[PDB]
Structure 1
Amino acid sequence: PKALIVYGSTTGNTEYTAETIARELADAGYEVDSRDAASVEAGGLFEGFDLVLLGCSTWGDDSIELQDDFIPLFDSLEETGAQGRKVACFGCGASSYEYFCGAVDAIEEKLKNLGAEIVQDGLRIDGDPRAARDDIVGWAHDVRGAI
């Protein structure tokens, strides 16, 4: 299968999660294209992919704000070709906050409204992702079994 991973990361935690997920998928034989949201054009972005994984950290002071580089893509998500596309979301946040990983919920809700097929509920990491390696690995295994 061919998967696309697009991540929005300010301090590199969601980028480290995206790289862990990319290796799990490549180790199982998938074809994997991993891109920073900062380098991406929304226009037909998901075209030709069997699975699309979107990663984004949460910002703002209990007023959800998406990671800076991901904003433009979220704004033009209606142009990516998400209708009928198998997708799943992930991101890093702080479980202590009002909207823990609220950017993962917001992205899932728009994808749902755009006709995408959410194959798995979003992976929401608390704290340092390097300490949540087994959950990341376990979530990537489950998405593979869900497509």
Structure 2
Amino acid sequence: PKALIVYGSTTGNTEYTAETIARELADAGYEVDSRDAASVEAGGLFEGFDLVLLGCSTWGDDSIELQDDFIPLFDSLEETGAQGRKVACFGCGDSSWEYFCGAVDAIEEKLKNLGAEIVQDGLRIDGDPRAARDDIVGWAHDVRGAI
């Protein structure tokens, strides 16, 4: 099986989290392709992948805004090949904000409309993800067991 991880990260937190998940999946036997959202195009992005994991941090002055590099992908999600695709989401944030990891919710909701199959509720990391390593590894393991 092939898994794609696409992340939008500005300060490196969601990127670390994506790398952590990627190693877990690889150790299990998946062929993993991990890509920064800045480097991808939406159109047919998910083609060929058995599992897609999308990660993004949350921004915005007084609204929920997705990480800049992820925005174009979210805006064109309908062209990615999400129907019937097994997906799960993750993100980093900071619980000082009420809309903690709000990006994750926005992405999940769109995916559901698009007919994707959300295999596990999104992983939401507060603060330094290295401090949450066990939680990330545990979530990767739960995603695997949910396929």
Could you tell me how far apart the structure 1 residues matched to 2:138 and 2:67 are? 25
TM-score, reference length from structure 1 = 0.99
Answer whether contact 1:22 1:34 (CA < 8 A) is retained. yes
* Pairs aligned (count): 147
Stretches of structure 1 lacking an aligned partner (at least 5 in a row): none
Could you tell me how far apart the structure 2 residues matched to 1:97 and 1:103 are? 12
Could you tell me how far apart the structure 2 residues matched to 1:18 and 1:114 are? 23
Deviations 1:33-85 (Å, cap 9, x if unpaired)? 00000000111110111100000000013410000100000000000010000
Could you tell me how far apart the structure 1 residues matched to 2:62 and 2:83 are? 30
Q: Could you tell me the percent identity over the aligned residues?
A: 99
Could you tell me how far apart the structure 1 residues matched to 2:50 and 2:72 are? 23
Does the residue aligned with 2:18 lie in a helix, a strand or coil? helix
Alignment of 1:73 with 2:73, yes or no, is yes
Alignment of 1:135-146 (within 5 A): 135-146=135-146
TM-score, reference length from structure 2 = 0.99
Stretches of structure 2 lacking an aligned partner (at least 5 in a row): none
Could you tell me how far apart the structure 2 residues matched to 1:70 and 1:48 are? 20
RMSD value, Cα: 0.6
Q: Larger deviation: 56-65 or 46-55?
A: 56-65
1:86 CA displacement: 0.2
Could you tell me how far apart the structure 1 residues matched to 2:133 and 2:108 are? 22
Runs of 4+ displaced beyond 4 Å: none
